[PDB]
């Protein structure tokens, strides 16, 4: 009601890459594609919200 | 489940076996 209004012109995506060596980052790629090296995460809150 | 079916004569009036699910879509 109070006349506030937002308008989005452009939204761009950034991504900072570590310049890892192409044999180190190929070794790290091949280790992280194993089913034993799966990246498992956790929500910090970890709760149901009722 | 013949006690749930109506009796045409003395046989239970059952449906078909494969007439359980639907399959209709907008042209398919």
């Amino acid at each position: 009601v109070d006349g506030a209004s937002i308008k989005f012109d452009s939204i761009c995506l950034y991504a900072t890459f570590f310049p890892m060596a192409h044999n180190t980052a190929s070794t790290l790629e091949a280790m992280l594609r194993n089913d034993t090296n799966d990246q498992s995460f956790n929500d910090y809150l970890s709760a149901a919200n009722m | 489940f013949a006690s749930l079916a109506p009796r045409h004569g003395s046989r239970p009036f059952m449906g078909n076996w494969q007439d359980i699910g639907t399959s209709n879509m907008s042209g398919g």
Partner: protein
């Protein structure tokens, strides 16, 4: 209790036109059913095409 909404609605669906085409495929659409106000929009065929 769980309060998890089972109606996940997406705005690129057309639930109205999905119901207008469903009644055509299952029943005679020319008939008039007053309770759901089921009376299909129908131009006169001699007014459109002279």
């Amino acid at each position: 209790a769980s309060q998890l909404n089972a109606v996940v609605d997406l705005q690129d669906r057309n639930t109205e036109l999905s119901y207008q085409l469903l009644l055509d495929s299952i029943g005679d659409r020319t008939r008039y059913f007053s309770m759901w106000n089921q009376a299909v929009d129908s131009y006169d065929p001699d007014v459109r095409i002279i």
